[PDB]
Amino acid sequence: DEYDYLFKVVLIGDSGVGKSNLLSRFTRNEFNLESKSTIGVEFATRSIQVDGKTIKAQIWDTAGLERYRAITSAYYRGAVGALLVYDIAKHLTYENVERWLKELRDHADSNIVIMLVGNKSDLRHLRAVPTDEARAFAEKNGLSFIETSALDSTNVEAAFQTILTEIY
Ligand SMILES: Nc1nc2c(ncn2[C@@H]2O[C@H](COP(=O)(O)OP(=O)(O)O)[C@@H](O)[C@H]2O)c(=O)[nH]1
Ligand SMILES: [Cl-]
Ligand SMILES: [Mg+2]
């Protein structure tokens, strides 16, 4: 509805890390504590301002589990950014970041902007993934890095703003 650029940005990451609530927090300012596996593929949109011009962010979301049906290059097609999300309270979701990176190399453009997102920062007292460690990891792998909380809203706007500005 009037925009200068449409930037496709995808969300990826293990089931349960907060992808769907990052989407809902960013596009509708809504959060649900309930947990429910995402159905098929969804996308939602939000427009923001960058360098005086209007950026329509089209943000895709899908299930992190790829057992019976796996994500294809069509999911990633034309994506200029990826929010690769893990749960700072569940170490396994961070261990699996390498698998997501492999999936991005196989299925996404070699120059996509990748933001590593440590979500659930409000669970800092349950932290399983030290901030400094993830930050260095992002550094070595050519990713941006931010910790967010969809629940209390911390850094959610900043994460999307930053990636869309990096892309711009
Ligand atoms: N404490 C906390 N819980 C979160 C946060 N984001 C998502 N959740 C919860 O984690 C569960 C999985 O969230 P969901 O958005 O469905 O993650 P997805 O499985 O990666 O799409 C739900 O119970 C959410 O309410 C967060 O920032 N903090
Ligand atoms: Cl599946
Ligand atoms: Mg989901």
From Swiss-Prot:
Outcome of swapping S149L: Impairs protein folding
Cite a single GO MF annotation: syntaxin binding
The record's principal subcellular location, in a coarse class, is: membrane
EC numbers listed for it are 3.6.5.2
Pinpoint motif Switch 1 by residue range.
31-42
A cellular component annotation (GO) from this entry: cytoplasmic vesicle
- Where in the chain are disulfide-linked cysteines found? none
Alphabetically sorted, this entry's keywords are: Acetylation, Cell cycle, Cell membrane, Cytoplasmic vesicle, Endosome, Glycoprotein, Golgi apparatus, GTP-binding, Hydrolase, Lipoprotein, Membrane, Methylation, Nucleotide-binding, Prenylation, Protein transport, Transport
User: Which membrane topology term applies here?
Assistant: Lipid-anchor
Q: Which cofactor does it need?
A: Mg(2+)
Coiled coil regions, renumbered to chain: none
Q: How the protein is affected by changing I39A? A: Abolishes SH3BP5-mediated guanine nucleotide exchange
UniProt entry tagged with the keyword Cell inner membrane = no
Can you tell me which residues bind GTP? 15-21, 32-33, 35, 37-38, 64, 119-120, 122, 150-151
Q: How is it modified after translation?
A: (Microbial infection) Glycosylated on arginine residues by S.typhimurium protein Ssek3.
- Phenotype when changing L33P: Nearly abolishes SH3BP5-mediated guanine nucleotide exchange
- Reaction(s) this enzyme catalyzes, per UniProt: GTP + H2O = GDP + phosphate + H(+)
| Motif placement: Switch 2 | 62-81
Q: Give the enzyme class.
A: hydrolase
Q: How is its activity regulated?
A: Regulated by guanine nucleotide exchange factors (GEFs) which promote the exchange of bound GDP for free GTP. Regulated by GTPase activating proteins (GAPs) which increase the GTP hydrolysis activity. Inhibited by GDP dissociation inhibitors (GDIs) which prevent Rab-GDP dissociation.
Query: Which GO terms fall under biological process for this protein?
Result: amyloid-beta clearance by transcytosis; astral microtubule organization; early endosome to recycling endosome transport; establishment of protein localization to membrane; establishment of protein localization to organelle; establishment of vesicle localization; exocytosis; exosomal secretion
Q: Where does Mg(2+) bind?
A: S20, T38, D61
Query: How is this protein organized at the quaternary level?
Result: Interacts (GTP-bound form) with RAB11FIPs (via their C-termini) including RAB11FIP1, RAB11FIP2, RAB11FIP3, RAB11FIP4 and RAB11FIP5 effectors. Interacts with RAB11FIP5 and STXBP6. Interacts with SGSM1, SGSM2 and SGSM3. Interacts with EXOC6 in a GTP-dependent manner. Forms a complex with RAB11FIP3 and dynein intermediate chain DYNC1LI1; the interaction between RAB11A1 and RAB11FIP3 is direct; the complex regulates endocytic trafficking. Interacts with EVI5; EVI5 and RAB11FIP3 may be mutually exclusive and compete for binding RAB11A. Interacts with STXBP6. Interacts with VIPAS39.
Q: Which family does it belong to?
A: Belongs to the small GTPase superfamily. Rab family.
What is the annotated role of this protein in its UniProt record? Answer: The small GTPases Rab are key regulators of intracellular membrane trafficking, from the formation of transport vesicles to their fusion with membranes. Rabs cycle between an inactive GDP-bound form and an active GTP-bound form that is able to recruit to membranes different set of downstream effectors directly responsible for vesicle formation, movement, tethering and fusion. The small Rab GTPase RAB11A regulates endocytic recycling.
Q: What is the protein name given in its UniProt record?
A: Ras-related protein Rab-11A
Q: In the record, what lineage is assigned to the organism producing the protein?
A: Eukaryota, Metazoa, Chordata, Craniata, Vertebrata
First-to-last residue of the parent protein present = 6 to 173 of 216
